[PDB]
């Protein structure tokens, strides 16, 4: 591939592992989710710019617009979780076991 791709590709892996291992806060994981889209944004832009894929120069912007809209929907749920149990801890969200 190339030398830069290794770190971008390894940055996605770090964020994925970070998202799959919650500690206590729900806000912490949403950041790991928005880190993933940042790595995908940079990785796609590197590919498109280097190959002179002109019409694909708009794709990274579309990736950013939808990923931010999804992030907004994520924060709204976090707020409604905090207004119920007083904190954004994931251990509280355990009613559905039974």
């Amino acid at each position: 591939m190339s030398m830069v791709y290794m770190n971008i590709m390894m940055a996605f892996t770090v964020s994925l592992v970070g998202l799959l291992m919650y500690r206590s806060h729900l806000m912490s994981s949403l950041l790991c989710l928005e880190g993933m889209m940042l790595s995908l944004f940079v990785m796609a832009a590197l590919t498109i710019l280097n190959s002179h894929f002109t019409l694909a120069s708009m794709m990274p912007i579309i990736l950013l617009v939808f990923a931010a809209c999804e992030a907004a929907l994520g924060l709204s749920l976090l707020v409604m979780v905090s207004n119920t149990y007083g904190t954004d801890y994931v251990q509280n969200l355990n009613l559905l076991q039974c």
């Binding site: 809209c69 907004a72 207004n83």
Partner: protein, 101 residues
């Protein structure tokens, strides 16, 4: 390289003033002194984000006016702005832009 030096100088200068500001008066020796989530604020931030994203789709308009398909380009340009105004109307009528409990 020029833009890199300009950023380095500005932030390096700011750091110096900050540290010498926390130390220059400490060259002096003064005797030791001793001894609710709001929903409406959150909705302003989220409304700004969705509006801010729609602005991202409008920034390339000046370049988009150089095309040979002005009829198509002018149709979609007025569609995005009209849709952005429709979002404002929905929040306005649904009491989104209010600060009274």
């Amino acid at each position: 390289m020029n833009l890199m030096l300009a950023l380095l100088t500005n932030f390096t200068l700011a750091t110096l003033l900050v540290i010498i500001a926390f130390w220059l008066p400490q060259l002096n020796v003064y005797s030791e002194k001793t001894s609710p989530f709001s929903m409406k604020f959150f909705l302003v931030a989220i409304t700004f984000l969705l509006f801010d994203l729609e602005i991202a789709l409008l920034l390339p308009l000046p370049w988009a006016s150089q095309t040979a398909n002005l009829n198509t380009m002018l149709t979609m340009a007025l569609f995005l702005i009209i849709l952005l105004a429709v979002s404002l109307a929905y929040e306005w009528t649904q009491k989104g832009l209010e600060w009274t409990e």
